[PDB]
mmCIF file of all heavy atoms in Angstrom:
data_model
loop_
_atom_site.group_PDB
_atom_site.id
_atom_site.type_symbol
_atom_site.label_atom_id
_atom_site.label_comp_id
_atom_site.label_asym_id
_atom_site.label_seq_id
_atom_site.Cartn_x
_atom_site.Cartn_y
_atom_site.Cartn_z
ATOM 1 N N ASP I 104 21.002 -47.708 28.445
ATOM 2 C CA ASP I 104 19.571 -47.461 28.382
ATOM 3 C C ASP I 104 18.988 -47.795 29.743
ATOM 4 O O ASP I 104 19.440 -48.727 30.409
ATOM 5 C CB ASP I 104 18.885 -48.266 27.277
ATOM 6 C CG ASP I 104 18.699 -49.716 27.638
ATOM 7 O OD1 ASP I 104 19.638 -50.317 28.198
ATOM 8 O OD2 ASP I 104 17.610 -50.257 27.361
ATOM 9 N N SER I 170 14.470 -51.923 23.202
ATOM 10 C CA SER I 170 15.184 -50.663 23.400
ATOM 11 C C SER I 170 14.750 -49.583 22.420
ATOM 12 O O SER I 170 14.782 -48.395 22.755
ATOM 13 C CB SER I 170 16.684 -50.879 23.281
ATOM 14 O OG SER I 170 16.987 -51.603 22.111
ATOM 15 N N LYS I 174 11.402 -45.279 21.389
ATOM 16 C CA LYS I 174 12.003 -44.117 20.743
ATOM 17 C C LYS I 174 11.268 -43.737 19.459
ATOM 18 O O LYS I 174 10.292 -44.368 19.055
ATOM 19 C CB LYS I 174 13.482 -44.379 20.450
ATOM 20 C CG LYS I 174 14.319 -44.702 21.667
ATOM 21 C CD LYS I 174 14.463 -43.477 22.541
ATOM 22 C CE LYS I 174 15.228 -43.767 23.813
ATOM 23 N NZ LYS I 174 14.541 -44.778 24.644
ATOM 24 N N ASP I 407 21.415 -46.381 21.926
ATOM 25 C CA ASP I 407 20.721 -47.124 22.978
ATOM 26 C C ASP I 407 20.642 -48.608 22.646
ATOM 27 O O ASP I 407 20.861 -49.462 23.513
ATOM 28 C CB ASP I 407 19.320 -46.556 23.199
ATOM 29 C CG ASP I 407 19.272 -45.540 24.323
ATOM 30 O OD1 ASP I 407 20.285 -44.845 24.549
ATOM 31 O OD2 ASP I 407 18.223 -45.444 24.989
HETATM 32 MG MG1 LIG Y 607 15.259 -47.768 26.594
#
Side-chain angles (χ1 to χ4, degrees):
Chain I
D104 76 317
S170 49
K174 301 291 177 299
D407 265 31

